[PDB]
Design a protein around this ligand. Structure first.
Ligand SMILES: *CC(=O)Nc1cccc(C(=O)N2CCSCC2)c1
Ligand SMILES: *CC(=O)Nc1cccc(C(=O)N2CCSCC2)c1
Lengths: 304, 304
């Protein structure tokens, strides 16, 4: 029993983190096989970042200008290229700790673990969600970019995020490992405002199911609703619209608890309309939305 | 910027987890040097757990009755002993992945990372605190006991917790790695009620400092208080008494923010008396108490 905001064990990713230095800029890189992936803004001075021309800046850079250090050992860079907003540094040594891995581009509402790193050294691990506005709410100080987000399926690490920037509102933007930003953000020190940070409804419902499984039941009510009725209330409260696809995804939790998805929607509707009245659910005073239905099943069933 | 409930990177501990089987009971063990540590209730049937005599049960057990499996390779058990509520299984092979480590007995209010494991396989990592009632609020299913809690100082893992039991209220009890339970709990399936789960005041204040550092400032007020005045309010709200030792520990955060500890106490007092009025602090609707002052400095300064 109990339900925690749980990250994947980070060891497989720890074994991939390196330091990348270009001139006076140092950040983190991801070493998989004989390639090191890092944000392309490693080539920028803070001055460059106001309006960088990355292709032009890269012309001034040779293989020997990219210093890659794995622990306290230097890797030899034998090639470099820019793919979207990442650099790929070819090194002469395959990472001996390379796990089975994939690159995945996640959808908003999907959760992942971040291994926060500084100078290629792991500092901490925490669980994030891709927000509906394609930001994440992370914990990233100076030196953290190139820190990665990932999911693990048994022995395969799916990398989904590399950290690039902090918006002036202190929320975070980054890329997949093909170097494509999530959302409309660019690797430039300019005006970039996030859109509405809406609540991930399907995740809230998953977490209400988790609450019921773990004995938090006070919010279960006598009501049901319809997708369209629920969605009117969702709209009012800046919750994402619930689709039949979301209902289908919650089916296993519905089955386990015997609470129809639309009944849990009606419970959520009343919580939105009535508030918590100073009560808590799984130790939270707000409705948690950074657990996916898959997360709730995993943690409630004990997958490794 | 940003502030997250962050665990230590778990790789060093992942390399220590093994499966221990005695008859039909399987749980987790910690392999350091040539010793495997595990809960002594590995020798019990669920029936035994009603009123176990561990010394008597252990007489029926030989080295060859303890099956220890590290990945898919079996370790040879050449010795076993009971120390308090843990078994120490001597194996013929030193764990080649043994990190620098210590065993520490933590005090209530101290935080640590848990690597939740099943059959010696890591499932997840999360951050906990030793509650003032010597419970932890974990996420532990059947098969999770022998999962460990730890802090990391650079390259040294300090192990502070091994999971043993779930109280009927779904909170968790366990031992240090010398096998001594935190608090009054025993490894028996009997009536064990937890005491008052009081709020760790010094940790709340640390987290208010973290909030100010990260731009959440709405709760800063025009007031100050005294330790004795604050403590009257703390008592009313089931908060731990604040001592001058706690004030001294918050000095660096006081210095960084320029907010006197007693001024932040006065802010906390008003939050206790007035509530949040539907506002949030660092994405929480309640006052978070599972960050230590050391945690806030670490995460706000980016230690690896
Ligand atoms: C991605 C990231 O962290 N960018 C960055 C921005 C400014 C400065 C640096 C940098 O090189 N350092 C090393 C010295 S201490 C500050 C971080 C990186
Ligand atoms: C420490 C712990 O998890 N204890 C425990 C209690 C009951 C049963 C087991 C056990 O052996 N298994 C393996 C089969 S599936 C249930 C967990 C362990």
């Amino acid at each position: 029993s109990g339900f925690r905001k749980m990250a994947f064990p980070s060891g497989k990713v720890e074994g991939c983190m390196v330091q990348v230095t270009c001139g006076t800029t140092t950040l983190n890189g991801l070493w998989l096989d004989d390639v090191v992936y890092c944000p392309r803004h490693v080539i920028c001075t803070s001055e460059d970042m106001l309006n960088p021309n990355y292709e032009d800046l890269l012309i001034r850079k040779s293989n020997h200008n990219f210093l890659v250090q794995a622990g306290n050992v230097q890797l030899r860079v034998i090639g470099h290229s820019m793919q979207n907003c990442v650099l790929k540094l070819k090194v002469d040594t395959a990472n001996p700790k390379t796990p089975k891995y994939k690159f995945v581009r996640i959808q908003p509402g999907q959760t992942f673990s971040v291994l926060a790193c500084y100078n290629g050294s792991p500092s901490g691990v925490y669980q994030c969600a891709m927000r509906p506005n394609f930001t994440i709410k992370g914990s990233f100080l100076n030196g953290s970019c190139g820190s990665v987000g990932f999911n693990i399926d048994y022995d395969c690490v799916s990398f989904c995020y590399m950290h690039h920037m902090e918006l002036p509102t202190g929320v975070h933007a980054g890329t997949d490992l093909e170097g494509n930003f999530y959302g409309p953000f660019v690797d430039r020190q300019t005006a970039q405002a996030a859109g509405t940070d809406t609540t991930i409804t399907v995740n809230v419902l998953a977490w209400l199911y988790a609450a019921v499984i773990n004995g938090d039941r006070w919010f279960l009510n006598r009501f049901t609703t319809t997708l369209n009725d629920f969605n009117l209330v969702a709209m009012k409260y800046n919750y994402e619209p619930l689709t039949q696809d979301h209902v289908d995804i919650l089916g296993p939790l519905s089955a386990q608890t015997g609470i129809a998805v639309l009944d849990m929607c009606a419970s959520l509707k009343e919580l939105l309309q009535n508030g918590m009245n100073g009560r808590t659910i799984l130790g939270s005073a707000l409705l948690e939305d950074e657990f996916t239905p898959f997360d709730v099943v995993r943690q409630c069933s004990g997958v490794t």
